Design a protein around this ligand. Structure first.
Ligand code: TH4
Ligand code: TH4
Ligand code: TH4
Ligand code: TH4
Ligand code: TH4
Lengths: 208, 208, 208, 208, 208
């Protein structure tokens, strides 16, 4: 029977923003899917590209669930009130530029959806952008401090159109986008960190 | 008899900045109206524009109302102490740069007016900007996380001149500006999100 | 009987930074006078200017008064501890860049002086900058959300040289500066808002 | 029997971010190791480079130690909640830009690991970058305010690869990176401050 | 018998960051000495220079004093926990870019030292930079809101090398550095404000 103000007030009491909601000591499964909106400044010479995309991030936080029999089953909450995967583009050369309100969608069962529009610059393979096969820029996104046992990242497998969200007014066109999964590991640290490798195949429009 | 201090103190007591002020299941009615102030940069090749506009935003938050029969019926309040629509430009390629003091005007009847001066960059149709008929850049603005059942957005038609606020020193000129209501929906999300579609018809100024 | 630490204490106990210190229900008299220090990146084709100035701002706030018969009559105080006029340049195209500590000077009688050095870009008339008559760039500054009945702004007329503070190293030189008070109103809003119009007549320094 | 929520609570409640965690009267032993990921901009004329590197930083704080007999032995914690070494690149000409979530890992034994990905500009020898022997840009990093008696700096002792983390799409390549321990001192200050002189020997990729 | 935590806690208990540490109506004596590290982005046409210096700043607050006979006689403390002179470069045209941790050194006798490394752009005389006699760029730094009877500044003119800290990889070199005390006053304000005028004599490097 509680209103929306109550659902939020109760989230502040149960939600520990700095505590990863690990349950039955099993990694938190984070789903990550980049919705490409536009490809801006491209420099084949320096192998750098500016990209705008909506990062659809979904996961479950047990400590957030509530009874929605006699009340709203969803509310928007500031990400500062909840725990959020500490994801990062392993090959980014600029910090992520969040262009939208930093609010996440929370379902009464604990399901969380955070989908910010992000603009960011990447260090990838730009060669071939001005060709028919185009270039394929690969973006590695995974947790920065939570190894495979605390966080698992998997791409949301859905055959949705690759350029469904892509701006028609962009100078470039998307040929294909494949989001695979991997597990990076270095000599700095023993364990392995999961990541989703998003390969963006694009090229310039209006070519001869 | 009460001063402005009482009105503010009262707002700090009832205002819930992180909770949408909806009554029943009826969504919050947000009115959006853009007053174009300047068109700074335009790129015919990349289809990008840098513009300055005043985003006239109004809505109702009855949980803020107060008795003004013997006190001011309006006060300027910092937006941080109020709930504000999580509006965003769906095709912006830069974060909104707010140029003015972040204060809203609150009327004793619960009405809220927030009109910031914003400089922002968009990806839109720039073709024809050098012709007499000009270019037509469409800017879509709507709630980012609140679907139609939660937030409604509509323009504000009138007999106002599209150049009433426009700078005469700009390199461009406005031909016509029409703001229509529209709705967006992606395969990411089931429900639909209302948005105001602002069509800016402008061209570069001639030796005239 | 009191020291600078006690003054600050009492100030923090009576000052209401988010409440305009209305006196007798009359509008707060705000005085503003720009002291030009430099003219930097000028562009006659885009009618854009980048200038640096000290914005001399004064007003009265009775709620800050204190007896200084045998105590300091003046103290520097962070602006966050005081109410400040929500002033904005109506034709600015970049946010004000405050180059100095944000401290204000408060006198025991309630007089407040805030004079920050600001770097900011404006949209204004730059035509003729490289001619002998020079260009005349007009900058409009006034309250953003407080109308005439709440705040009043007038140029702090004081016998002084137009380039008393102007850098001798600028590529440009000031020919004249006239600061006149005015008023603005739009079909958006019923009441009027006061502003000060600063006309900066300048030109690129010749050679021979 | 305590979970991560309990551990995080304890750490946050025990950590003293402003107090150097000096065990006994010995200095705090900090280990620093730069893992270069890219060399973005290089200017031989101005001897200035723009580089992206992960700064492996480790130290100990016994106050955070907890019993992990039947509890996690590592947790992610925001650095704002921990004391962190006040490291500064002595030859940096721009503030370090942290591109990743500012979280550190704290082991149950009080061991702390913080490894952010940082983009920063340095003033260093770039002459010879376009030769087979390449250029050797040396970067000095150490405590800014804690001398040898309070903080000691040593390069992560380990025979590792220099290009392991390096981007294959960079316009440059790494020939060698020798990170040697060192010390600095000036007439300003009588004591000595330890640092880690990192020698970056790199050159531009051949057109082949 | 007091650890560094106790020294900080005492400081946190008596320090008044927003209150100048005045002693018997005498002005606080602040010492300022710039150590040049690099000279970059120089423009003889616009008379603007980018400079990087270690602004050595010292003053005294004897209320923070403690007995260090058998306790550390120095501690590093965040400036946010201390009162710091509101110093400003009068002819700077960009805000100060602080490149180092913002920590100060408090000594057991009440002395405080703050020496951040700063990168800032200035408006000054750059003419003659490419000549043997080089150019002389003057930089003024003094209190922004505290007049002569509240704050006094003087250069720590000692017997040191002007290029002791100066980078050998800079395109320029220092011929001489004279740091003299000085004062300023404008029609705006009745009292005078002290400042140290640093005359930097530098020229480009040209093996000829
Ligand atoms: N393997 C490995 N290392 C990885 S994968 C993603 C980030 N890292 C390095 C790292 C690991 C832990 C911390 Cl606190 N900071 C940086
Ligand atoms: N349809 C759809 N999706 C839309 S319309 C406007 C924004 N979005 C995406 C979205 C939806 C929900 C959240 Cl919490 N964040 C982003
Ligand atoms: N007329 C009019 N409108 C003016 S004059 C100066 C600023 N404005 C717009 C405005 C009016 C009210 C608020 Cl809360 N915000 C912006
Ligand atoms: N010698 C010397 N000085 C050094 S080595 C590393 C930094 N410094 C300068 C310094 C020393 C102390 C403080 Cl509080 N701030 C800056
Ligand atoms: N003379 C004079 N005025 C000076 S010297 C250095 C700064 N100023 C102006 C000033 C004076 C007082 C305040 Cl609160 N803010 C700025």
């Amino acid at each position: 029977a509680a209103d929306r103000a109550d659902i939020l007030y109760n989230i502040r009491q149960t939600s520990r923003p700095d505590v990863i909601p690990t349950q039955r000591d099993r990694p938190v499964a984070v789903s990550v899917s980049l919705k490409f909106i536009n490809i801006l400044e491209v420099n084949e010479i320096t192998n750098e590209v500016d990209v705008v995309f909506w990062q659809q991030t979904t996961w479950s936080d047990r400590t957030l669930a509530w009874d929605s029999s006699h009340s709203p089953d969803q509310v928007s909450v500031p990400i500062s009130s909840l725990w959020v995967p500490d994801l990062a583009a392993y090959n980014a050369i600029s910090k992520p530029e969040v262009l939208t309100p930093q609010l996440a969608r929370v379902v009464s069962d604990g399901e969380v959806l955070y989908m910010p529009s992000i603009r960011q610059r990447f260090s990838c393979d730009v060669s071939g952008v001005d060709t028919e096969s185009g270039a394929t820029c690969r973006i590695k996104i995974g947790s920065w401090t939570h190894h495979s046992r605390e966080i698992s990242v998997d791409p949301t497998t859905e055959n949705s159109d690759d350029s469904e969200y892509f701006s028609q007014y962009s100078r470039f066109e998307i040929l294909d986008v494949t989001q695979k999964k991997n597990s990076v590991t270095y000599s700095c640290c023993p364990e392995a960190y999961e990541d989703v490798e998003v390969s963006l195949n694009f090229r310039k429009k209006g070519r001869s």
